[PDB]
Design a protein around this ligand. Structure first.
Ligand code: GUJ
Length: 128
């Protein structure tokens, strides 16, 4: 839809790429575990503001992010470091908290994914 923005970048041949043990941990452990969570489905693809009748969404959220985009960035090696990927997850959670009312169902769902995310990120291995 023309009323939805293009998705966040997932392919850019000019951007340097690098595989790190931390990035492998983010795909194998963090993304894998969050993706199967009962509350993951609203976060598995960009917010479709047209379909969901949220016409102001992209007037408020200027740095959209979702796990579908993160999954593509991890599987198609878009990142140089783990911090870029962790920032994407944090952007996804923050966008949800900014747009929605505290205590809304979608906020409780993002909070459950973030609690699981924090448990996994505290165990982030050191580089090798
Ligand atoms: C499919 C989506 S994606 C989404 C929402 C829905 C519908 C919905 C409603 C209640 C419970 C679960 C899902 C609803 O809140 C707006 C919003 N802000 N960030 C996100 C992600 N969303």
């Amino acid at each position: 839809s023309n009323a939805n923005p293009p998705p966040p970048e997932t392919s850019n041949p000019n951007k340097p790429k690098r595989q790190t043990n931390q990035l492998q941990y983010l795909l194998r452990v963090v993304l894998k575990t969050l993706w199967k969570h009962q509350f993951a489905w609203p976060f598995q693809q960009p917010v479709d503001a047209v379909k969901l009748n949220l016409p102001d969404y992209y007037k408020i959220i200027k740095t959209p992010m979702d796990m579908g985009t993160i999954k593509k960035r991890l599987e198609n090696n878009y990142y140089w470091n783990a911090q870029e990927c962790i920032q994407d997850f944090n952007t996804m959670f923050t966008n949800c908290y900014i747009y929605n009312k505290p205590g809304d169902d979608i906020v409780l769902m993002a909070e459950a994914l973030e609690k699981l995310f924090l448990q996994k990120i505290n165990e982030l291995p050191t580089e090798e």
